[PDB]
Design a protein around this ligand. Structure first.
Ligand SMILES: Nc1ncnc2c1ncn2[C@@H]1O[C@H](COP(=O)(O)CP(=O)(O)OP(=O)(O)O)[C@@H](O)[C@H]1O
Ligand SMILES: [Cl-]
Ligand SMILES: [Mg+2]
Ligand SMILES: [Mg+2]
Length: 158
């Protein structure tokens, strides 16, 4: 099954964390990376104080069940999602979300797939469109259609 995973980091200098996460994704059992999108920059929410967000999309071929994959992405967030500062570990700065899982619709306590808000997020749709321009959602909506309808501004690469 082809799973699409959204990667985000709002660390001030996020490249090393993102690469560590990408490597870890490739190490997930019964799985392997098919392709990785470019890295996209989005300004912080509200207050300009915060760092920009680095966003990307990964296509992962996997024979794991959806919630088994979530266990692994959540493990990676616990293991690599926080960065040590001088005398303290920082908060979680890495976010791994399952955008799509094959052509499956999932609605459990732990999982909502397709991701509940992805159709509102250029930070998700643009990197996904780069790696899967012909993508069709479970309900028959096309990724191209969503982008065409909303006419989101394009995001700058990192
Ligand atoms: N498609 C999906 N991918 C990942 N987690 C998901 C998910 N659908 C539901 N969840 C649930 O989302 C819960 C909260 O995850 P968080 O990472 O804290 C939300 P977030 O990603 O910061 O915001 P967002 O969901 O608005 O993108 C998890 O405990 C997980 O069970
Ligand atoms: Cl660009
Ligand atoms: Mg998220
Ligand atoms: Mg998340």
């Amino acid at each position: 099954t082809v799973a699409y995973i959204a990667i985000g980091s709002n660390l001030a200098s996020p490249l090393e964390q993102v690469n560590a996460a990408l490597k870890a994704l490739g190490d997930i059992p019964e799985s392997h990376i098919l392709t990785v999108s470019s890295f996209y920059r989005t300004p912080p929410l509200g207050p300009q104080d915060q760092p920009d967000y680095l966003n990307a999309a990964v296509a992962l071929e996997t024979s794991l069940a959806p919630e088994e994959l979530l266990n692994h992405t959540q493990r990676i967030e616990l293991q690599q999602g926080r960065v040590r500062k001088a005398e303290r570990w920082g908060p979680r700065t890495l976010d791994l979300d399952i955008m799509l899982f094959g052509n499956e619709v999932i609605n459990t306590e732990r999982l909502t797939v397709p991701h509940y808000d992805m159709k509102n997020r250029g930070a998700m749709l643009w990197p996904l469109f780069e790696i899967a321009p012909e993508l069709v959602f479970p309900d028959g909506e096309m990724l191209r259609q969503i982008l065409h309808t909303r006419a989101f501004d394009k995001l700058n690469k990192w």
